[PDB]
């Protein structure tokens, strides 16, 4: 598989009512990138090739269920992937909320300039507010993870360096 290592036992998060059938584990090193993309990918598990879709909105430790992929037969049986993000952070999602570090040089957070700020779905360009402080959070909504309100959004922790 492209990021799933392999099947396992006792993988993660052993309290989720599923099966019905033969359950699947399998442990995956995730990028944090991943976490937001959520797309098709390469699982191989007991040499079962299948393309796995796992949904965004995924974090360190998360246990993520695909129903027919574990139990192959009527009774659909899931396959729980516990994903574990890279020793690189940035994004904690929080729920359906973001939080990431943004440090700005000190002459931009006077005359209140604009800052690229690396995100899990590409750049997006803060206008930090005129003469802001260091420790405050910028709020750029729409640019959060999906969830119950629609889309969440990303509060950006100053740093005035």
Same mark, same amino acid.
């Given at each position: ?32 990138? /991943? ?24 974090? /360190? ?63 997006? /360009? ?36």
């Amino acid at each position: 598989a492209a990021l799933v290592a392999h099947v396992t036992s006792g993988s993660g998060g052993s309290g989720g009512s599923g099966g019905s059938g033969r359950d699947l584990r399998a442990e995956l090193p995730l990028t944090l990138e /991943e976490a937001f993309h959520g797309g098709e990918r390469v699982v191989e598990v007991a040499g079962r090739r299948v393309s796995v879709r796992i949904p965004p909105g995924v974090r /360190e430790g998360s246990v993520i269920r695909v129903p027919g992929m574990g139990g192959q037969g009527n009774p659909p049986g899931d396959l729980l992937l516990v994903v574990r993000l890279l020793p690189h952070p940035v994004f904690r999602l929080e729920g359906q909320d973001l939080y990431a570090t943004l440090d700005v040089p000190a002459p931009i957070a006077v005359v209140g300039g604009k800052v690229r700020a690396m995100t899990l779905e590409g750049p997006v /360009e803060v206008a930090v507010p005129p003469r802001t402080q260091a420790g405050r959070k910028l709020r750029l909504k729409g640019k959060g993870f999906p969830g119950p309100a629609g889309r969440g959004d990303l509060y950006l922790e100053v740093r005035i360096t």
